[PDB]
Structures are given as structure tokens and as C-alpha cells.
Amino acid sequence: LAYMEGGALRSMSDKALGALRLAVADNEHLRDALRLSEDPKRPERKVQFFIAVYQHLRERIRQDIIRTDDPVDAIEQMEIELARLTEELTAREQKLAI
Amino acid sequence: IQSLTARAPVWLAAQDTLNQLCEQSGETLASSNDVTEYMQQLLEREREATVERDEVAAQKRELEKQIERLSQPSGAEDSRMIALAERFGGVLLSEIYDDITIDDAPYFSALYGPARHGIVVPDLSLVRPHLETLEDCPEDLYLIEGDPQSFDDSVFNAEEQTNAVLVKSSDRQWRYSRYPELPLFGRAARENRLEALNLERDALAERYATLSFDVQKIQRAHQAFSQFVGKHLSVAFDTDPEAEIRE
Amino acid sequence: VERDEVAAQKRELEKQIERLSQPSGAEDSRMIALAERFGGVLLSEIYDDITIDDAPYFSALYGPARHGIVVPDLSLVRPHLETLEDCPEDLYLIEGDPQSFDDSVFNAEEQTNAVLVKSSDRQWRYSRYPELPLFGRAARENRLEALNLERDALAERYATLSFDVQKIQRAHQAFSQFVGKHLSVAFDTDPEAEIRE
């Protein structure tokens, strides 16, 4: 992004915020943090919002089947699980009984 | 400077994707040829992991088939035998011996030999008309005559020996059966053995799960590298523009 | 992936053919040793040459007893019986002349594609006609050749797939080299016009 003008950066930021408002509608902690983040004169608030998001995700990982703490890395493991489960779903068809 | 500036963002995007990709792997890439050789090593790991996966699959299939033979109703060649048991006024022999203890089970299994899973039918002439119709049955069907409710020991020319039994089946014919372990009859503890088999098959299921997961991981890694080269080589491994612009 | 698949199937066929150890189709040597230990001969060895047309009928007739020793005495076995431990778990023995083996005692009655045998008092045995009978083997070379035909078909398919993969890899190397040495100028316009200007 270093080789872009500020107008494009603001456009992306605004559209991302538009998506976030809907994504985070139900939660309250994240909603409070996002609310606090939008004053341009206090930048660290945005990174604090980011930290809140990451922690919130880490609680929901369900490590019974997954081990990565970083969610971004956890995406690949969910993808692998989908592929493997779809493969197991194939067929057996040895059906014969009383 | 204008040329370098136009070129820079593409090179930077390419570098970020490359760093993510190689860091995701254990080995660090440095050139196009290097990436290709890494492709080849990835293929070799695919085709090894798949072989172990398939072999474990074969073992698991054998285990389920073995377990299934011991299931129902009195574990036998159940596919046709149950219908064949009711289509004549008879009872399955293995079912008559459902209750026998573990100590007499090997003896009886040796005694009855292949005929363990025959049917008891007290006349054997009433089947003679039905018989021509039997086109759907095990390749060797055994029939015995006696009272199904209080069946007497079939007249065998039997003779007990050390850990074995001798029998005269016919004039000029004898059979000699050695005591097996974990027999057919006594289908009370044969549930004990299928319990042992369930415990055995659990491990195969677990191991197969891990192997399949590994194969999928390798396949997706190859997909990632292919996607990369599809979208990336135009500027891969080129010299850093930040430096030259600074200069 | 496909050439590896075909190689695996060809291994399976080769394993199946190898399982035809001796002479063509494996026969248990331990039974030969037992036939040596008692005066007699292995039954399949007696009927190994019967016609393929009647072979399924005979195999249906004998059932499990197909693998057994023809001992005309039955006096040598009984003393040695308690000495037998390595033998197959269900050993079968028949009495008759090994050189000219008279029909075994079966009250056999022939049904449509099946046989019925009154084995004993209060016992009948019923069997259907199989294929690949133990008798009338004649080495069953035709089955060995059918398996060889299948194996050679798999080998040919494997050869074609290996050749195809080699072609594809060569094309890949060509492209790698090209983007390594001409990509910087690929698809650009002719400089002579600009030089003229």
C-alpha cells in the first residue's frame, strides 16, 4: 500500500468499516472497541480493536480438532478438513440384510 | 525513477506472496529452477503417503469384513442361510450350539468341521423336491437329520485324540481335525473376540484419518504452488526496487 | 498420478501370478511331504489331467475333500496320527489304489449345475458347479496366460503414461527457460519503427 494515494486508502478503509458494522453487529465488546476506534486523533485504538478481534477468535478455535493458535493459519486446517470429509463421504454400498 | 516506480508495487506483492509461501514450507526458495525441483519433491511425497494410506485402508476393510462375519444372528454365512433355514422345517446348527461353553467350543468346532454351519432337517426327503430350485446358496450346503429341539449327537465315527479328532465320514474316507482357537460355536464369547476386533479396528481408523489428512495437505500445497506460478513468475526473484530508487 | 495407479495395479497382477508358484498355480508342498510319509498320492495329482469340461463337475463332487491323500491301507496313519502336528488343520484321507483309483464312495446324484451327495447316515451335502476346478488342471495355463494378457495390458498402459509424462516435463522445462531468459522482452513491439523515428 505504500505506493498509493490517500484517497484510495480512505475508500478501502470506509468500505471495510461498512462491512465490519454488519459483521460485528451482535457482539458487544468488539462493537464498543470499533466505536472507540473511529476518532482519527487516537490511532492506537484501532490496533487495540485488532487485538480484541484476534483474542475473541482464539477462544472460539475449538482445539479438539485444531491446534494452531493463530486463526489465519487455522483457515488452512479448516480447508483440509473440508476436503477430507468430502472424500470420506463417497460410498460403501455393501447393503444386504434380513 | 518513473520506470522503477511503475514496476515497484507488482514486485512487492509478488515478494509478499513468495515469502508467505516458502515460510509455509520448511525449505526456502531462491530461483525458478529451485521452485521446480521443490515441485518434484512434493510429488514424491504425495506418491509415498498415498501408498501407506491405501495399505492401511486395505487392512481396515479386512477388519470390518471379519467383524461383520461374526455379527448376526448367530454369526454365519448369513447372506442366504437365514432364509434357507426357514424355507425348510429346520434350524441352523450353529444356533443350536449358541450356548456352549468356551472349553467345549474348540472340541465341537473340530468335530463338526465344515458342517458347523449346516441346517438340521429331520427328514431330508422333503428337501429333495425343493432342491432343484437352489440356485442361490453357498457353494457347499450341509444338511443334517435329527430333532431340532433335542438334536442328538450326529452319528459320527468320531474318535478323540490329543488336541485333535478323527472321524470316518464314509467307507474309505477319514477326516482329521486339529483343535482351533477362538472357534465358531459358543457364540457367547465370540462376542468377546469381536470386542477385541473392535478395539483393534479403532487404531486403524485413527491412523487412516491422520494419513488422509497428510495427503490432503500435500495436495493443497501443490495447488498453492501452481496458483502462485500462474499468477507470479512475471516478476519473481527480481532485484529490489526500494534500494535502487533510494540510490 | 495415473501412471502410479497403473503401476500399483500391475503389482497386484504380478502378485497374483506369483501366487501361481508351482507348477502353474501353487500347490502346498507340505501336503506332498505328508503324501511321502504315508504310502499314497495326492488326489489332485491323480485327477490333474482330466478334461476341463468335466473338471467343474468333479470339483463339485469332492468338495472340501478335493485336497487329500489316497492311502490304500489306512493302517500306517492311525499309529502316526497322534504324531501329526504341522499338518493342515482339516486333513483328508481316502483309501484306494493310487495307480488306478476306483470311484470314491459317493451316493452322488447329478442336478442342474449342481451335485447332491449322501455323505453319511443322516447327512447329505449339496454343491454347485464352480470354475477353476482343482481337478483337470492341465496346469490351467490358459488362466496364467489370461493373467499375463491383463498384466501386459497394464504394462503397455503404464508405458504410454510414462512417455506422456516425459513429454509434459520437457515442455515445462522449455517454458521455465524461456521465462528465465526472454520474459523481460516478451510481447513487446518492434523497435525498428522507433529507431526510424
Add this chain to the structure above:
Amino acid sequence: AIRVTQSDRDLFKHLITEATSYVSADYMRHANERRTHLDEALALRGELFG
């Protein structure tokens, strides 16, 4: 299982993307603003001193 994992993956993949973009774009905009401020300071300093 496929249903549950599908839902989890969709949620993660969308929320993480929006959070990351929203935060990082602003971070870079601040970096560029600082660079502009430094350039302005140096230019006006240079011509003032000269």
C-alpha cells in the same frame, strides 16, 4: 461435520479479512502522512536556510 466446519470457516475468513484491511489501511495512511510531513519540513527548511 461438514456443515459445522463450513459455518466456522465462513465466519473466520470474512471477519478476519475485514478487520485486517480496516486496520492496516489506516496504519499505512499514517505512515504516508508522516513521510509527507518530513518531506515538507526538509524542503521548507532547505529553502529557508539558503
